[PDB]
């Protein structure tokens, strides 16, 4: 799974 705190600026759903 992606680490969603790799870059907090990324919203993975859009």
């Amino acid at each position, epitope marked *: *799974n*992606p*680490d969603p*705190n*790799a*870059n*907090p*600026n*990324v*919203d*993975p*759903n*859009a």
Partner: antibody
Amino acid sequence: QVQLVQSGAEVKKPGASVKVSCKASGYTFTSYAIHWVRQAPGQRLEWMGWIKAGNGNTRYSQKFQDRVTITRDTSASTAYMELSSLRSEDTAVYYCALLTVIRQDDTFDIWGQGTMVTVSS
Amino acid sequence: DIVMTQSPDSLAVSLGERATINCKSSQNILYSSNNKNYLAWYQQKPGQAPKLLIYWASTRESGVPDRFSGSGSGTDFTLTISSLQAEDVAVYYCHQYYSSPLTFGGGTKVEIKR
């Protein structure tokens, strides 16, 4: 007109510390994360860490996690990076960046102009 | 730690021909839960900070010319410049944001043959 504006070039002695400011204007300062990315002479882009500009919370690259300190001052719309125990290998251009702000409401990416730090006596 | 390896490290094509830049991640960066590859492409011209061209491996950033296209999936990606303009001279980087730490490739210097 979203702008990130960094402090001017500096020369610091080996073992000293350097602090680079990154003024961020044109948008809600507390909304996004400001990253710090450096680039040595002739070498690649190297991510150092980010700071959540609202939270104040941080993540540092492992390589730098005992040497780097990233802060923010919301009233001054400014992020800062500090690098201690400098070595000549740290001679580089340091950037702040709003890296890949990906949203359905516009995806944008905005870098500072970069700051030259020379480690030298 | 995901490492990013680009090939070639420099290429030289005559104006109006395609420039092909390849990039490999040491691990998969496709998220099968949302079918998105966590890859980006930057173009960095001398004296300047990198500029974003492509994200999600193949979506163009607002304002980027159509000759810039990214493809690939999983662990193999490619930046294709379909007709190289004089002003496309720069070093190009791929960039993963699947896992922390964020990492970039080594760069592909793209230069015009004339």
